[PDB]
Design a protein around this ligand. Structure first.
Ligand SMILES: Nc1ncnc2c1ncn2[C@@H]1O[C@H](COP(=O)(O)OP(=O)(O)O)[C@@H](O)[C@H]1O
Ligand SMILES: Nc1ncnc2c1ncn2[C@@H]1O[C@H](COP(=O)(O)OP(=O)(O)O)[C@@H](O)[C@H]1O
Ligand SMILES: [Mg+2]
Lengths: 458, 192, 55, 64, 118, 460
């Protein structure tokens, strides 16, 4: 009952009778050759025209085709039936099994929970990772974000967190792959299915090959599946593989939607697009969502508008850096930029808090000397400041750890380090009780015991 | 009144301007953003008692009213030279500068004493605090002037070593824990 | 012994200052790459703001 | 397959994009300069034997 | 205008302008509102011509004289962004005040080594 | 018969409107009567409705609206061939010197396609310039591009004249000099420095200088190149000098701004790399002949990352940088052996003996460069005896890189020498293999071959 009138890249304009124009976010349908193409309207231009985004390949569309108005928004399968299966942005099953026997379908556009319904939790969550749970401990039901450039470890860290908390966790889990490699999605699907945990994970995948609209709405499609388990009374884990692609897909489409560019070419509505998503991924009195989000920062510029506007939406922020990863120090967390809302004397105890702050102080004091060391050499440093440097370097190395998911790279077996066991090692290194041991005794060891043991072999 | 991140209000107003296709400016901000923050912040005023009587139609006599503003701004990478900070720094009567190097080095609160200003100055202090803070200002001033040598501290003459070691101590004295406010008597006692 | 230690002090300060001059020289060659990168980015951002703002 | 310079492909796409008056982004590259290389390099893949069977109408069995 | 009226009576008035920097910011805002294409750092294109229209009426004619004292905020102490950079062409003396001197207690806080006069 | 009419004039951009079926094709030339003289317009774009947008190859002042425009059915065409040797011409191939008409018979269009894939030479030869420093440390490929990054007061013009002389005499090739966008004073004094050395009859000059509208500075390089191509088709080996390629970039930036196209990387046109490529891809060695090119390059803001140098260096094969220092010591030519580079220096192309001889002298000089600082600070006799020998050989090598030109006789008085490559390799192997240690360094200076250094030491 409508005609196409323009096809610019990924956006399509459709003309309808004045009295039947669809509403915003309703879904239309066309026939692109043999296939059926779903459009989602973004704007109601004047005169019955409506401007839409194609959820599929836009090639092959002529003008004047006839499009049908489906009178409901995009709706996805939801609930228990969607568990252990892979789905499109449109909720269609993408593994070669049959239909999803869903009893209910939910619109992917929803309002965030009211302020009255929110809930706050001080219950610490423990992970096997030294640096994360010393510098930036995070709590059940809270948001976590791994900030880093390209190729620094923010996917390997997310797979390690999945390993350490997701298998030892009762409730279900949801994994949304937003604009990342299909290879990694296949690898993760098969690793899960081979350990029989797949029947606890729901997967959504709008990987990098797909046109902008799929990457644009796949994140919402995942949040809906998560919100369902939350409202059912359960507690959920939500892993988003790269939330930067959700805004990159908005930037790709913005100019075609006829909107004046902004700070660095970004859409004028960047902060609202980002908030309208991250405000509904929260825990509430009727259930809790625990979420880990990888956040790519373009060109390693931590001040680009997209990371800068994301920082405000996370409780614990872990900032990876290339200058550390280039030292072979994995994980490459930058201890002088990672933080957590949960690092307070009240929440984590005076001993943990004090050790974390001492480590920060030492590493910063070492940063301040790095230029005088560069120009004048290390022999000009006062004897007090040469001890600071050696302890700083020992601490730099002791934050490294082997991961079970990185055996494929280094061959060394992974390690799981309890919190009680790491604050002790750092208290020791700082207080000086290990101040007679070569630095390389600390590279890639689990606990301080293993370091004093490795020193025997040099 | 505390305005949390007037730098997010500026972004919302930029979005509204760009969607109404208004002429963009620097960093795509509209022209009249200074006029947006100015007519907001010029409401924080102290009014004389005659204005209060005229307003309340004689119900309240002989009392001044007052409204204090503490707008918060976030600078990306310490660049005070951006469209929004360079306006609000010009509109306000003062500037408390919090720095990340001090915050990391343990100096919490992380106020930079040498780059922060309050144009009201001593007029807004109890006379005990006005008396005592004069020496703190000069101690930190001489310490900031000598700081360059802190890396070559061993070479210095003891006549300046005392100034540097007094500066470091008055700097360690201004550190304070969160949610632990001091009454004016305790602050004056410690500064004495 | 005192005089020999003095001559060794001078000969050591000489090599230390030579190495420091060479390290400063090798550091200029990094600061200038960063400087050029920032110059180009500022030109591009300003000119793009003007042009894509007009009309 | 070897792409001799995917840096010069990006420059030629930047040309084609600027000649159409499309708002540029960082370093004057268009918004979709990532998608340009993404939809290209995501084709270099390895496929399981069922894909090879279904594609080739069953002429080829078991190979990948 | 008020100063010029007093001058035309044969008096020697003194004109105080409380901030040139905000005169240039008002010009920038007014120019951005009218939709003119911006210049070097967002400054209107007519920056130097507005500054000359102002400063070229402050002069000592044969009938009277207008002297002037003008405060000029230097943003971020750079001395190089177009506003102080364009005001220097008109001034006959420059008194530079430093917060470092002021912090040592010695007001007026004038820097004697950077102050100058033609 | 004229058919169009000027409809807009804005700076150097002129719009003319033709009948709907007679719209000129792009790059076609048009002409108009700008008062008492004709003016040539080059089409840049076709807008809709029979309107076409052009750029004037001349000052556009005086142009009314509605003037008739005659549509030449071909691009700008220039005279080519032997007839143009020793003349001076502007972008449109008009004799700009006052010695009258050019007596050519054939005229070529300046817009052309690069040689197809299967015309290119299926070999890789080398060009024997005849200069020791270049032939050793920065050999030229026949049909390659050579950047010349020297500054001022170092002899760029006399190096160019020596290359012209040698490539005319010791080969049978001509030369073409395109004066893109540089001072008129240098053009006039180059014309004279060449007329009084008898090389003017061996070079064809085309000049579009800083005082010209943008279109002239844009297309002058194509004029020079399309004369060099005519010389190539005769089977010759040709040499093409460009006075500054950076100004050929900047004229295109100006024009692109005039046309209103969106800016790109750091202020440049969006078509920077294609404008540079369609030029640099026409000077190649064809199965019939070859065009070699020596191009002066200016790097903005001392940045080798700026888009213009970064785009140019994609095409340069060799690179010779002149140094004020090496001149101050008195060694002429003033090439810097440590900064001059060539991607022809590989055993697989130049051979192992030449490659390792060049690498030898390079290592010797780059050690001497710091042994000399050790001397400057600690005095000579602080050195080791091995190092004193290194210094004593480095000084000799450094002297032997001088040469007397046939063009420099008017300064040195000594007769000019042309040194074959074999002789330079022999001389430097000898000086580096410990031979000739028995004669003084001033026996090598400004000599020529080593077989003349021995004779100079004989009489010293
Ligand atoms: N614990 C680790 N041990 C060894 N290598 C690691 C470790 N963590 C990360 N890496 C390295 O990180 C590199 C980047 O991988 P990945 O994390 O997928 O990049 P991205 O940040 O884009 O996801 C890997 O090739 C791997 O070698
Ligand atoms: N081969 C040479 N022999 C003698 N003198 C030379 C030689 N090459 C350059 N010179 C001297 O170097 C000076 C530089 O002159 P010139 O070439 O006009 O400067 P530029 O090359 O910068 O235009 C000349 O005056 C000339 O005397
Ligand atoms: Mg990854």
């Amino acid at each position: 009952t409508g005609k196409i009138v323009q096809v610019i890249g990924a956006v399509v304009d459709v003309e309808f009778p004045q009295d039947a124009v669809p509403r915003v976010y309703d879904a239309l349908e066309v026939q692109n050759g043999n296939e059926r193409l779903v459009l989602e309207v973004q704007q109601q231009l004047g005169g019955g025209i409506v401007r839409t985004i194609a959820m599929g390949s836009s090639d092959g569309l002529r003008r004047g085709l006839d499009v049908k108005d489906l009178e409901h928004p995009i709706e996805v399968p939801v609930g228990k039936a969607t568990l252990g299966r892979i789905m499109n942005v449109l909720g269609e099953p993408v593994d070669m099994k049959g239909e999803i026997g869903e009893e209910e379908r939910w619109a992917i556009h929803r309002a965030a929970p009211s302020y009255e319904e929110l809930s706050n939790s001080q219950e610490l969550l423990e992970t096997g990772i030294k640096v994360i749970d010393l510098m930036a401990p995070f709590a059940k039901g809270g948001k976590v974000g791994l900030f880093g450039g390209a190729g620094v470890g923010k996917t390997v860290n997310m797979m390690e967190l999945i390993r350490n908390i997701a298998i030892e966790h009762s409730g279900y889990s949801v994994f949304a792959g937003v604009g990342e490699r299909t290879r990694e999605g296949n690898d993760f699907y098969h690793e899960m299915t081979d350990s029989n945990v797949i029947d606890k994970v729901s997967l959504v995948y709008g990987q990098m090959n797909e046109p902008p609209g799929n990457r644009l709405r796949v994140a919402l499609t995942g949040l809906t599946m998560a919100e369902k388990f939350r409202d059912e009374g359960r507690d959920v884990l939500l892993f988003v593989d790269n939330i930067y692609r959700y805004t990159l897909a908005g930037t790709e489409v913005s100019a075609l939607l006829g909107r004046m560019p902004s700070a660095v070419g970004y859409q004028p509505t960047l902060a609202e697009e980002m908030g309208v998503l991250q405000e509904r991924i929260t825990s509430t009195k009727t259930g809790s969502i625990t979420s880990v989000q990888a956040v790519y920062v373009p060109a390693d510029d931590l001040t680009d508008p997209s990371p800068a506007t994301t920082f405000a939406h996370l409780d614990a922020t872990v900032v990876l850096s290339r200058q550390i990863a280039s030292l072979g120090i994995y994980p490459a967390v930058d201890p002088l930029d990672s933080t957590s809302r949960q690092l307070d004397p009240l929440v984590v105890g005076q001993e943990h808090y004090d050790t974390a702050r001492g480590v920060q102080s030492i590493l910063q004091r070492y940063q301040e000397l790095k230029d005088i060391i560069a120009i004048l050499g290390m022999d000009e440093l006062s004897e007090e400041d040469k001890l600071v440097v050696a302890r700083a370097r020992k601490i730099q190395r002791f934050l490294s750890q082997p991961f079970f998911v990185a055996e494929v790279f280094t061959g060394s077996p992974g390690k799981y380090v309890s919190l009680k066991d790491t604050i002790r090692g750092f208290k020791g290194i700082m207080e000086g009780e290990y101040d007679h041991l070569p630095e390389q005794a600390f590279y890639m060891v689990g606990s301080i015991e293993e370091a004093v043991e490795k020193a025997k072999k040099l | 009144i505390i305005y949390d991140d007037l730098s997010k209000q500026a972004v919302a107003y930029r979005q509204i301007s760009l969607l109404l296709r208004r002429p963009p400016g620097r960093e795509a901000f509209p022209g009249d953003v200074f006029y947006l923050h100015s007519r907001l912040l010029e409401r924080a005023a102290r009014v004389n008692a005659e204005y209060v009587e005229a307003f309340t139609k004689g119900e309240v006599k002989g009392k001044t009213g007052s409204l204090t503003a503490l707008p918060i701004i976030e600078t990306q990478a310490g660049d005070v030279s951006a469209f929004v900070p360079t306006n609000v720094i010009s509109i306000t009567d003062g500037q408390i500068f919090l720095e990340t190097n001090l915050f990391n080095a343990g100096i919490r609160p992380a106020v930079n004493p040498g780059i922060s200003v309050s144009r009201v100055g001593g007029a807004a202090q109890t006379k005990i605090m006005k008396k005592l803070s004069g020496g703190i200002r000069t101690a930190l001033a001489q310490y900031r002037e000598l700081a360059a040598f802190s890396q070559f501290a061993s070479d210095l003459d003891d006549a300046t070593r005392k100034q540097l070691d007094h500066g470091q101590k008055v700097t360690e004295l201004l550190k304070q824990k969160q949610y632990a406010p001091m009454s004016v008597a305790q602050q004056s006692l410690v500064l004495f | 012994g005192v005089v020999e230690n003095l001559a060794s002090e001078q000969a050591a300060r000489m090599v230390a200052m030579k190495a420091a001059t060479d390290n400063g020289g090798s550091l200029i060659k990094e600061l200038q790459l960063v400087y050029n990168k920032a110059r180009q980015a500022s030109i591009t951002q300003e000119l793009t703001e003007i042009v894509s703002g007009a009309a």
